[PDB]
Paper text:
We also solved the crystal structures of these menin mutants, showing no structural changes in the MLL1 binding site on menin. We found that point mutations in menin do not change the protein structure and only minimally perturb menin residues surrounding the MBM1 binding site. In contrast to the predictions from computational studies, the crystal structures of the menin mutants revealed that these point mutations have no impact on menin structure or stability. Furthermore, T349 is even more distant from Pro13, and the T349M mutation changes the conformation of M327, which adopts multiple conformations and approaches MBM1 as a result of the bulkier side chain of M349. On the contrary, biochemical studies showed that M327I and T349M mutations in menin have a relatively minor impact on the affinity of MLL1 binding. Our structural analysis clearly shows that all these point mutations exhibit a steric clash with the menin inhibitor Revumenib, overlapping with inhibitor fragments that extend beyond the Pro13 binding pocket on menin.
Numbering used by the authors: 2 to 53, 74 to 386, 399 to 461, 549 to 588
Amino acid sequence: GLKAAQKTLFPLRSIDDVVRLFAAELGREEPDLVLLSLVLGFVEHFLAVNRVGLTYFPVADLSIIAALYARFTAQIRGAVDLSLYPREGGVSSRELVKKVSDVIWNSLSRSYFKDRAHIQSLFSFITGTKLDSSGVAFAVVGACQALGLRDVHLALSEDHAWVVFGPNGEQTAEVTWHGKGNEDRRGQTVNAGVAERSWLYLKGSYMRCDRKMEVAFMVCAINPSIDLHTDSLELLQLQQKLLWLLYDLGHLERYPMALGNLADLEELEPTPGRPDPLTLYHKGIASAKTYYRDEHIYPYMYLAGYHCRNRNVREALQAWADMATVIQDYNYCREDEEIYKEFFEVANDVIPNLLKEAASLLEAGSQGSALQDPECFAHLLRFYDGICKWEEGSPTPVLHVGWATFLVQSLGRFEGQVRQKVRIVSVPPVLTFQSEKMKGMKELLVATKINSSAIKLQLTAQSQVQMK
């Protein structure tokens, strides 16, 4: 049950009242994940899903929130008999974690769109019997906290969620699905995925949350979207204030994606007296380097996106090259398609559009153009090099001829005299290639008119030209 001290701030009449509740719960040894998710889901429902009747803020009455809370705890306590799963050493068993996962899973509506907005919270679970993938993982952790299972915690990659538990928190269990059309692995470890060096499991350099980081997860999970063209200003402000609360308390230190989210929010609407977006993006990169062996892609993606939006071509190219330098040490595996799509879109859409505008501006007499900067040409080359090296050793290939036309066009946006300045140096501006594909392509990179046909042959598996 909710404790008297958890009840005293209600009713919550404003954004700032919600923030005060989060501050009060974060001052406890176990912030109450169920309470906090239900509150966020309630206000997100009445600020983004149905704004009918809204005049300022959807007041959250204790009676309403307590009844939702009681529905959740009744449904978990009645379905999970702890006596069947004795806790050896004050830690949980795999069978207990599987049972909790089953209880959440089996509660969900039989058929619904899993990609929908606003199905992340326990409010969605109780009122609509709908959750998205990571929403199930979070709900399992919240259920385990409600049961007294202090060792069960959320684990997060850049594209998936599961749990850690057990002796020293060293066990892993799948508790939800990943993507669409993949085979369920609920109950199993993540060790096969770690051992195959897929992006999905980050080579083991994934987040292992404490309770405070689980609060940060639900705050990052707030979705201000009303429709394709409209966000709730109220929810953006709430999320931003909550992220700064977490930041000040130290709970974003090990959470690169939260730092990126906060930077994005500051770019939209800066908070006076706070660090700039750029500072925050760089903090997210530093966090990844410090705590995650520099094995995360999104810290660089977030930075590159900022530079791209600000048409800072040099800076954007540098950050995408840095992205590619991370991915090069992975193997491209069967459930890694989201990061393939990101690299494909950068190479084959975003970079081409950026360089097309840069070429028009150069024609109009721009100075200091990325297209006249050999260091920028080197960043483009390093981006392709890391993608080629990623492909090496991978069970599934990355490149194909549909990449080749965009490579030739992008290369060609730099005049030959600029391209000539980069010295490509071998182990055993200056650039070293890691990939064999780019090493073989070196020869082709300085001609006044690039040999398109030869580039295509070198980038792809094709080794012959047409017969006739």
